Amino acid sequence: EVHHQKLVF
Amino acid sequence: EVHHQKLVF
Amino acid sequence: EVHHQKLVF
Amino acid sequence: EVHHQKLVF
């Protein structure tokens, strides 16, 4: 099980 | 199980 | 199990 | 003007 997230602005 | 996250602005 | 995170601005 | 009050028990 692999999971992630990002945020750019 | 591998997980991560990032944040850039 | 491997996990990490970053932060750049 | 005159006024007063009481309490008994």
Next chain:
Amino acid sequence: EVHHQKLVF
């Protein structure tokens, strides 16, 4: 003007 009060128990 006169005023007063009491308390008894």
Next chain:
Amino acid sequence: EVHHQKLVF
């Protein structure tokens, strides 16, 4: 102007 009060128990 006269005023007073009491307390008894």
Next chain:
Amino acid sequence: EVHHQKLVFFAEDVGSNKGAIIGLMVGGVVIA
């Protein structure tokens, strides 16, 4: 001209918090 006259009389634990569990938060940050 203003008069006033009170004879307040409380008997038992009026307005008390006896045995209560109280948690307040007015502002601030909690990262649990």
Next chain:
Amino acid sequence: EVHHQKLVFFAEDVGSNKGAIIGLMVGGVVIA
């Protein structure tokens, strides 16, 4: 002109916090 007259009378633990558990937070940071 302003008058006043009180005869406050409290008997038991009025307004008390006897045995209470109280936690306040007014601002501040807690990283638990």
Next chain:
Amino acid sequence: EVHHQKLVFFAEDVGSNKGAIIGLMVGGVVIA
């Protein structure tokens, strides 16, 4: 002109914190 007259009378542990557990935080930082 201002008058005043009180006869406050408290009997038991009014307003007490007997046996309470109290924790306050007004500002500050706690990195637990």
Next chain:
Amino acid sequence: EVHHQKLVFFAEDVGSNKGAIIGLMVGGVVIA
């Protein structure tokens, strides 16, 4: 087994009380 993953991001004074007038009363007695 329980996982979790957050990326909370607040920009301006989220949840703040800036300039507010706040009056609380949890129990107690006030004879005004």
Next chain:
Amino acid sequence: EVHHQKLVFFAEDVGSNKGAIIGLMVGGVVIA
């Protein structure tokens, strides 16, 4: 087994009480 992962990020005075007027009363007695 329990995991966790946070990236909290607050920018301005989040959760602050800047310039607020705050009055609390948790129990107690005030004969004003």
Next chain:
Amino acid sequence: EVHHQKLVFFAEDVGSNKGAIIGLMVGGVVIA
């Protein structure tokens, strides 16, 4: 087994009481 990982990041006066007027009362008696 329990893991954890935080990257808290606050920028400005988060959770501060800058310039606030704060009055607390947890129990006690004030005969004003």
